[PDB]
PDB file of C-alpha atoms and ligand atoms in Angstrom:
ATOM      1  CA  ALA A   1       0.076   0.230   0.254  1.00  0.00           C
ATOM      2  CA  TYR A   2       0.905   3.425  -0.676  1.00  0.00           C
ATOM      3  CA  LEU A   3       0.467   6.686   1.138  1.00  0.00           C
ATOM      4  CA  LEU A   4      -0.573   9.643  -0.656  1.00  0.00           C
ATOM      5  CA  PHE A   5      -1.070  13.040  -0.382  1.00  0.00           C
ATOM      6  CA  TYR A   6      -2.864  14.881  -3.081  1.00  0.00           C
ATOM      7  CA  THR A   7      -4.408  18.353  -3.968  1.00  0.00           C
ATOM      8  CA  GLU A   8      -5.709  20.276  -7.013  1.00  0.00           C
ATOM      9  CA  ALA A   9      -7.001  24.168  -1.959  1.00  0.00           C
ATOM     10  CA  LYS A  10      -6.987  21.443   0.595  1.00  0.00           C
ATOM     11  CA  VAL A  11      -4.687  18.529   1.010  1.00  0.00           C
ATOM     12  CA  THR A  12      -6.216  14.953   1.230  1.00  0.00           C
ATOM     13  CA  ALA A  13      -4.374  12.222   2.491  1.00  0.00           C
ATOM     14  CA  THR A  14      -4.987   8.863   1.854  1.00  0.00           C
ATOM     15  CA  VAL A  15      -3.742   4.769   1.985  1.00  0.00           C
ATOM     16  CA  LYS A  16      -4.350   2.645  -0.473  1.00  0.00           C
TER      17      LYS A  16
ATOM     18  CA  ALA B   1      -3.680  18.756 -12.437  1.00  0.00           C
ATOM     19  CA  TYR B   2      -3.046  17.332  -9.086  1.00  0.00           C
ATOM     20  CA  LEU B   3       0.176  17.928  -7.067  1.00  0.00           C
ATOM     21  CA  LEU B   4       1.143  14.508  -5.570  1.00  0.00           C
ATOM     22  CA  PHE B   5       3.366  13.696  -2.312  1.00  0.00           C
ATOM     23  CA  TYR B   6       3.841  10.018  -2.842  1.00  0.00           C
ATOM     24  CA  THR B   7       5.599   6.912  -0.566  1.00  0.00           C
ATOM     25  CA  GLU B   8       5.604   3.419  -0.073  1.00  0.00           C
ATOM     26  CA  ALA B   9      11.341   4.973   2.129  1.00  0.00           C
ATOM     27  CA  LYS B  10      11.349   8.263   0.229  1.00  0.00           C
ATOM     28  CA  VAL B  11       8.449  10.780  -0.346  1.00  0.00           C
ATOM     29  CA  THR B  12       8.159  11.482  -4.425  1.00  0.00           C
ATOM     30  CA  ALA B  13       6.485  14.535  -5.135  1.00  0.00           C
ATOM     31  CA  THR B  14       5.236  14.998  -8.879  1.00  0.00           C
ATOM     32  CA  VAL B  15       2.566  17.510 -10.764  1.00  0.00           C
ATOM     33  CA  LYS B  16       0.036  15.357 -12.832  1.00  0.00           C
TER      34      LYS B  16
ATOM     35  CA  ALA C   1      12.589  19.386  17.427  1.00  0.00           C
ATOM     36  CA  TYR C   2      10.950  17.517  14.695  1.00  0.00           C
ATOM     37  CA  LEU C   3       8.978  18.857  11.890  1.00  0.00           C
ATOM     38  CA  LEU C   4       5.599  16.861  11.991  1.00  0.00           C
ATOM     39  CA  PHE C   5       2.709  16.383   9.435  1.00  0.00           C
ATOM     40  CA  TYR C   6      -0.145  14.034  10.634  1.00  0.00           C
ATOM     41  CA  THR C   7      -3.566  12.958   9.668  1.00  0.00           C
ATOM     42  CA  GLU C   8      -5.932   9.900  10.735  1.00  0.00           C
ATOM     43  CA  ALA C   9      -9.562  13.650   7.245  1.00  0.00           C
ATOM     44  CA  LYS C  10      -7.247  16.544   7.500  1.00  0.00           C
ATOM     45  CA  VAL C  11      -3.350  16.874   7.716  1.00  0.00           C
ATOM     46  CA  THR C  12      -2.087  19.062  10.682  1.00  0.00           C
ATOM     47  CA  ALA C  13       1.506  19.969  11.004  1.00  0.00           C
ATOM     48  CA  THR C  14       3.396  20.874  14.260  1.00  0.00           C
ATOM     49  CA  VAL C  15       7.126  21.080  15.847  1.00  0.00           C
ATOM     50  CA  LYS C  16       7.790  19.159  18.588  1.00  0.00           C
TER      51      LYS C  16
ATOM     52  CA  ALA D   1       8.800  26.407 -10.827  1.00  0.00           C
ATOM     53  CA  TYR D   2       8.677  24.993  -6.886  1.00  0.00           C
ATOM     54  CA  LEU D   3       5.919  22.405  -5.458  1.00  0.00           C
ATOM     55  CA  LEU D   4       5.166  24.293  -2.239  1.00  0.00           C
ATOM     56  CA  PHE D   5       3.508  23.144   1.181  1.00  0.00           C
ATOM     57  CA  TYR D   6       3.328  25.697   3.361  1.00  0.00           C
ATOM     58  CA  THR D   7       2.224  26.312   7.269  1.00  0.00           C
ATOM     59  CA  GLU D   8       2.209  28.743  10.150  1.00  0.00           C
ATOM     60  CA  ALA D   9      -3.312  25.629  11.453  1.00  0.00           C
ATOM     61  CA  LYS D  10      -3.642  24.377   7.919  1.00  0.00           C
ATOM     62  CA  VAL D  11      -0.930  23.141   4.985  1.00  0.00           C
ATOM     63  CA  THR D  12      -1.595  25.289   2.155  1.00  0.00           C
ATOM     64  CA  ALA D  13       0.010  23.585  -1.160  1.00  0.00           C
ATOM     65  CA  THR D  14       0.893  25.444  -4.508  1.00  0.00           C
ATOM     66  CA  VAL D  15       3.088  25.579  -7.477  1.00  0.00           C
ATOM     67  CA  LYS D  16       5.132  28.763  -8.080  1.00  0.00           C
TER      68      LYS D  16
ATOM     69  CA  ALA E   1      -3.426   4.537  13.064  1.00  0.00           C
ATOM     70  CA  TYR E   2      -1.800   8.231  11.865  1.00  0.00           C
ATOM     71  CA  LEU E   3      -0.101   8.762   8.990  1.00  0.00           C
ATOM     72  CA  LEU E   4       3.188  10.791   9.659  1.00  0.00           C
ATOM     73  CA  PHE E   5       5.681  12.487   7.784  1.00  0.00           C
ATOM     74  CA  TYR E   6       8.549  13.703  10.071  1.00  0.00           C
ATOM     75  CA  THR E   7      11.733  15.014   9.587  1.00  0.00           C
ATOM     76  CA  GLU E   8      14.480  16.975  11.885  1.00  0.00           C
ATOM     77  CA  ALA E   9      17.652  16.578   6.111  1.00  0.00           C
ATOM     78  CA  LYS E  10      15.179  14.093   4.939  1.00  0.00           C
ATOM     79  CA  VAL E  11      11.442  13.659   5.148  1.00  0.00           C
ATOM     80  CA  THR E  12      10.453  10.196   6.164  1.00  0.00           C
ATOM     81  CA  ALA E  13       7.002   8.789   6.173  1.00  0.00           C
ATOM     82  CA  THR E  14       5.379   6.157   8.483  1.00  0.00           C
ATOM     83  CA  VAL E  15       1.999   4.868   9.756  1.00  0.00           C
ATOM     84  CA  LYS E  16       1.500   4.532  13.109  1.00  0.00           C
TER      85      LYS E  16
ATOM     86  CA  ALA F   1       7.868  31.137  11.765  1.00  0.00           C
ATOM     87  CA  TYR F   2       6.777  28.963   8.934  1.00  0.00           C
ATOM     88  CA  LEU F   3       7.053  25.510   7.675  1.00  0.00           C
ATOM     89  CA  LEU F   4       8.013  24.661   4.315  1.00  0.00           C
ATOM     90  CA  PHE F   5       8.506  21.819   2.152  1.00  0.00           C
ATOM     91  CA  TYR F   6       9.524  22.372  -1.397  1.00  0.00           C
ATOM     92  CA  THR F   7      11.106  20.883  -4.323  1.00  0.00           C
ATOM     93  CA  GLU F   8      11.589  21.206  -7.706  1.00  0.00           C
ATOM     94  CA  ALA F   9      13.666  15.069  -6.906  1.00  0.00           C
ATOM     95  CA  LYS F  10      13.575  15.341  -3.235  1.00  0.00           C
ATOM     96  CA  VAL F  11      11.702  17.017  -0.989  1.00  0.00           C
ATOM     97  CA  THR F  12      13.265  19.928   1.563  1.00  0.00           C
ATOM     98  CA  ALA F  13      11.828  20.807   4.687  1.00  0.00           C
ATOM     99  CA  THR F  14      12.802  24.147   6.548  1.00  0.00           C
ATOM    100  CA  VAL F  15      11.396  26.294   9.259  1.00  0.00           C
ATOM    101  CA  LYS F  16      11.655  29.882   8.540  1.00  0.00           C
TER     102      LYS F  16
HETATM  103 CL1  LIG G 101      14.797   5.069   2.009  1.00  0.00          CL
HETATM  104 CL1  LIG G 102      14.587  11.827   0.443  1.00  0.00          CL
HETATM  105 CL1  LIG G 103       1.109  23.336  18.120  1.00  0.00          CL
HETATM  106 CL1  LIG G 104      -6.951  25.392  11.511  1.00  0.00          CL
HETATM  107 CL1  LIG G 105      -7.332  21.623   6.019  1.00  0.00          CL
HETATM  108 CL1  LIG G 106       7.860   1.820   9.187  1.00  0.00          CL
END
């Protein structure tokens, strides 16, 4: 699984 | 485009 | 001291 | 250009 | 568990 | 003072 911080604004974190 | 910080370790940043 | 970003959602930054 | 995550609180991301 | 990025330098990511 | 993560690659952190 990876950790991802993403944004286009707020930073969203997810683990997939 | 998204700004992305990714990791499984080092953090990789990219713009997609 | 460490710089920390954490999240369980929002990313919170702190310096400890 | 730089990718920047900034904070003093919320983390702001920008591309400059 | 929390997602953590930390640094005192390199940024280290972990899940606790 | 602000916390900054920046990159053009490696993420560099700084506190100013
Ligand atoms: Cl490594
Ligand atoms: Cl690194
Ligand atoms: Cl604080
Ligand atoms: Cl806030
Ligand atoms: Cl936020
Ligand atoms: Cl670990």
